[PDB]
Amino acid sequence: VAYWRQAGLSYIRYSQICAKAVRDALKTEFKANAMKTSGSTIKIVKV
Amino acid sequence: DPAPATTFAHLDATTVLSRAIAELGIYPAVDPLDSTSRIMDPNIVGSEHYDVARGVQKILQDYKSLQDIIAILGMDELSEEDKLTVSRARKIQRFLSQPFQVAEVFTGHLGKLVPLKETIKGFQQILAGEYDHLPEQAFYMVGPIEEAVAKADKLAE
Amino acid sequence: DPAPATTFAHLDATTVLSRAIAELGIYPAVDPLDSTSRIMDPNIVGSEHYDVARGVQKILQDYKSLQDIIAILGMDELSEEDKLTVSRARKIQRFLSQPFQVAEVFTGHLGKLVPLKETIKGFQQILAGEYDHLPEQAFYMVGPIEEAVAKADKLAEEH
Amino acid sequence: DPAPATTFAHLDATTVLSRAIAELGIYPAVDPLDSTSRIMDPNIVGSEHYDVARGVQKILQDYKSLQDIIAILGMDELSEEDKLTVSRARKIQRFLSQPFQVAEVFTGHLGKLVPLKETIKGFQQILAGEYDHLPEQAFYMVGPIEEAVAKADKLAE
Amino acid sequence: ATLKDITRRLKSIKNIQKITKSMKMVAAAKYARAERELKPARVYGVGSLALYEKADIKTPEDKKKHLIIGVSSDRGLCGAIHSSVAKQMKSEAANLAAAGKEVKIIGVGDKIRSILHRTHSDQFLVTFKEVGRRPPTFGDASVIALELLNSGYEFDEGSIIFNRFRSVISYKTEEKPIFSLDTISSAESMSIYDDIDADVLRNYQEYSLANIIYYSLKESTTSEQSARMTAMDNASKNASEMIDKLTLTFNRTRQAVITKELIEIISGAAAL
Amino acid sequence: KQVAGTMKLELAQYREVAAFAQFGSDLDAATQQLLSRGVRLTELLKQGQYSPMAIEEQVAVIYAGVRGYLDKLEPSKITKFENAFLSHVISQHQALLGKIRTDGKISEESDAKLKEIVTNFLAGFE
Amino acid sequence: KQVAGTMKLELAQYREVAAFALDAATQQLLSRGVRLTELLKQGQYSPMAIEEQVAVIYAGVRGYLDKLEPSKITKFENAFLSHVISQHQALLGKIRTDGKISEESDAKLKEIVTNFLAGF
Amino acid sequence: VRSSAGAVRDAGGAFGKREQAEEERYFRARAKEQLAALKKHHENEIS
Amino acid sequence: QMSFTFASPTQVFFNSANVRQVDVPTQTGAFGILAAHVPTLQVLRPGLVVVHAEDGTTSKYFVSSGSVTVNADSSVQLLAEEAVTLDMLDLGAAKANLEKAQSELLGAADEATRAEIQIRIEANEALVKALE
């Protein structure tokens, strides 16, 4: 049981954080393309 | 035209036969919205007859309003109430068609007379939605509505 | 028609009142794109007045061009810049309406006289974006722009 | 309009120069598909002439239809029995162009007066596929088909 | 009608045709891009599904909690996309509730919500909008899965309905089962898989949920753009037919008006 | 003739894809370039009132426009560029304008001079 | 003059957003517009006294009918009159004679409509 | 015979009313949102 | 033989390939997959995958997260969430991110916030170690 699971998190959030940590450390040119194909645009409507 | 336009003021009941409707195959091609009458009064025909006639006219007018959009954007950009209106209106349009006896020679069908009570009952049923499971081509050229139901059953086979 | 068509050539200024704008409730129903004046030149009125007027006319014409698209897409599918044009155009369309002192009986409101500098300032600000947060209805039937701000404040308080 | 409605009653043919074809550098800019003739009838112009003309018209219409697909889905989407038709139609369009004797100061070539048999044979051969190996530009602004062969030899060698 | 009525109608239809042609071109470009992006996502999603079809899992027959997810979009003018999706969604919901279940619904895109806001208005666990403006990414699928897991409706079974993209002209509506770890653990087939506690398996289930959502999003957007292209083509064709008919009518009316005015002038001249 | 042939061709290309102008984005690069060049050219053809232009001025402006030297400027700025730029040539470079006028054509040397002038003025505008 | 002004504004707003058929505010705006529309209908050769028109339009525009279905509005209309025309002749006479909805008249009208709506 | 901008709403057919309503509903919603924000700003700036 | 499939959401590297060894880092300690590895299904961790082609050729891709499924019939599905070849990465940027994340660590508004922050530290440490 990873530490973050002891905090009640879910592996999706872990993957989000790791994706941010890996996509922020690319060659400067690659960051423009990496912005695409990433980053949500969805909204949630309270029901 | 001056001639028909002047004649209109000399008549109790009219019956504007239309070529557009006749091209759809509907026969008699009476345009239900141009046709009028002086005795279409709840104090002469009743309250079920009057209410049914006005419901039919209202649904046909709604369908006419939708037709322009339906023709271009297609019948997919319609709300569900509008699709129900379109289906009911087409069923009613077909149901108003009747096979005359004088046309037995033209088409080989059998002439039909439809007493007033049967007409009112059939249109009441179509309006209420009792026959939303039938295909619209089950009403095309039939006497009373039970003949439409029989036609639909035969279509199922 | 031959009569108005011929009369057009005998006038310096024209203000073509339009029914399509009177149906919307914008009164006076003066059509901003079908009205003209001879003095409407930068050398007679000034470059600020002329530029404000031409900006208003251009934004209204762009709005007309967009209305054709909105009839198929919908406001929800417009480029986030086009929605800005539509919003400015509607604010300007409403802000041209004004209550007369002789139309008290109809509207019931009170007549306003707007000095020229105040009209130029109001439209220059509406175009510049200094009011893209107030709702459209705040601009409907009011004199100077500050009255639109006050009407918006009242609308928000009684919200 | 009564004027052309009355003149068209007398016409025995039709030619339609189009701005959209002078853009392509084809000359004479006669619209191959909009042009019409009353004697384009197998009883008059003969079965072989009629069949060649009908085949050319059909292939040109096919290429016109395919051009929409090219503009939208991209050239890749074609089959192999459609890329071939596109190539054949482009070759036919090139071959329909001709150099005029009265335009030697506009084209740098020498005008050709192609007899009829030469034209029919050239288009029959192109339709049959006998020249699918040549480049399209070998057909641009040439007289009979043999000139297209010579142009291909001169530009490839 | 009169000549001005016909003229105004003709101008309006011409504008509509222009707009629909432009929208066809835009939809075609976006379709090309979405298909190009769909290939790698196709392989990725199929791989993520690999397990459940390699080690066959039968859902438990003693549970009542179910989830229905329906992928579509916010944009309209796409023909029978949202309609098919919502139709099959309500079919499944009716079947489940007749068999005795506790169904919920998640709507990815307004149009599903709207189609189902009359009936099934209370089963909305949560609905997402802002779909279709830009091509869906893995961020969107991760967000949807995260807001599904966080919303503590621990489901016992799942289904996702999307429009699988067959060809540029055709698409199919699919239902892909989604299982919870309560089913994966209690499967004889899963006995073989090694180092399979109930925590790595839970993380794997969360990731597979995100994967299936992403796969459905890519397939749905591809099919939606294709359908919008087809719908715009048909709408432009219908506008062209209507324009032809109205142009014929306009020419007739223009000639009739010329003749009428001229006859009025002639009668006045000869009646002096 | 030299500049107007290209200007007319480009404008004709722009008029058949002007419908997409509202969309514009989410289309190929060719139509993006067509829209951009067309908008620049239309903003070039705008003119004041009672301010005619000698032929040398017109050809200089259209030459700057149709060779791409304005594809970087924003359209709202073109009507200013056209203005300021013109004054520049009408003051600093009279020999080139006189050459174009009297000669009637754009000689290769004059073409090079126009290239240098347009680039030098555009190289520092803001 | 008092009542038809608000009715005119409500129908003017409704006509703008009528061509379709979400949020609470505009949904209620459409509801009020439709209620008033079905209120304005009438039969033949049965004109109504001005005070009766005022009563009906007041009931409709003071958000009372917004609870009822629209297809039933006509019923209410008819029924309402046949009630007020017998039990509350005094109020109608007051409205006619004084020619205005005074504060006491408004309070009465209010209680009559509130009572009748529930009892129907 | 040509076509001009702003013609769909000049005819006033069905598309004209449909477009008018599509515009009015959207801007009613946005006016509501902006009025709410204006009230919030009023309260937060009273002090 | 193996049926490897290494596919990011955006781009796909190996599809139904037939490789030799695959060294992958999972949550329960890294390990390696060969021709007939025992079936497993692990969840990747911010590390790197080394694929030895059918011969002795080796390729390294840095994976941020994902899942590796080893099935009965020697088919490996290794789905990452952001698999980038090493050549696309930067070195010192990783150190800067690591240090900034550590700096924010002390600003732990709550437990879960600290978990998030030092997950960022975990990923940055993996990045620097891969590039170091």
Numbering used by the authors:
A (entry chain I): 1 to 47
B (entry chain F), D (entry chain E): 323 to 479
C (entry chain D): 323 to 481
E (entry chain G): 1 to 272
F (entry chain A): 384 to 509
G (entry chain C): 384 to 404, 410 to 508
H (entry chain J): 8 to 54
I (entry chain H): 15 to 146
The authors write:
Adenosine triphosphate (ATP), the fuel of life, is produced in inner membranes of the mitochondria of eukaryotic cells by an embedded molecular machine with a rotary action, called ATP synthase. Mitochondrial ATP synthases occupy the inner membranes of the organelle and form dimers via specific interactions in their membrane domains. Each monomeric unit in the dimeric bovine enzyme described here is an assembly of 28 polypeptide chains of 17 different kinds, organized into a spherical catalytic globular domain that extends from the inner mitochondrial membrane (IMM) into the mitochondrial matrix, attached to an intrinsic membrane domain by a central stalk and a peripheral stalk (PS). This membrane-bound enzyme is a machine that transmits by a rotary action the potential energy of the transmembrane proton motive force, generated by respiration, into the catalytic sites in the extrinsic domain.
The dimeric enzyme, inhibited by residues 1 to 60 of regulatory protein IF1, was purified in the presence glycodiosgenin, Brij-35, and phospholipids, and its structure was determined by cryo-EM of single particles. As it rotates, the asymmetrical central stalk brings about structural changes in the three catalytic sites, found mainly in each of the three β-subunits, which alternate with three noncatalytic α-subunits in the spherical extrinsic domain. The inhibition of ATP hydrolysis in the isolated catalytic F1-domain arrests the rotary cycle at the catalytic dwell, and in structures of the inhibited bovine F1-IF1 complex, the rotary cycle has been arrested at 27° to 32° after the pause in the rotary cycle preceding the release of phosphate. In the current structure, the postphosphate release angles are 28.8°, 26.2°, and 25.5° in states 1 to 3, respectively. Therefore, the rotational angle in the F1-domain is not influenced significantly by interactions with the additional components of the intact enzyme that are absent from the isolated F1-domain. The PS is an essential component of the enzyme’s stator linking the α3β3-sphere of the F1-catalytic domain to the membrane-associated wedge and the adjacent a-subunit into the stator subcomplex against which the rotor turns. During catalysis, it prevents the dissociation of the α3β3-domain from the central stalk by clamping it in position from above, and it resists the rotational torque of the central stalk, preventing the α3β3-domain and the rest of the stator domain from following the direction of rotation. A cap provided by the N-terminal domain of the OSCP is linked to the N-terminal extensions of the three α-subunits and adjusts its connections in concert with the rocking of the α3β3-domain during a catalytic cycle.
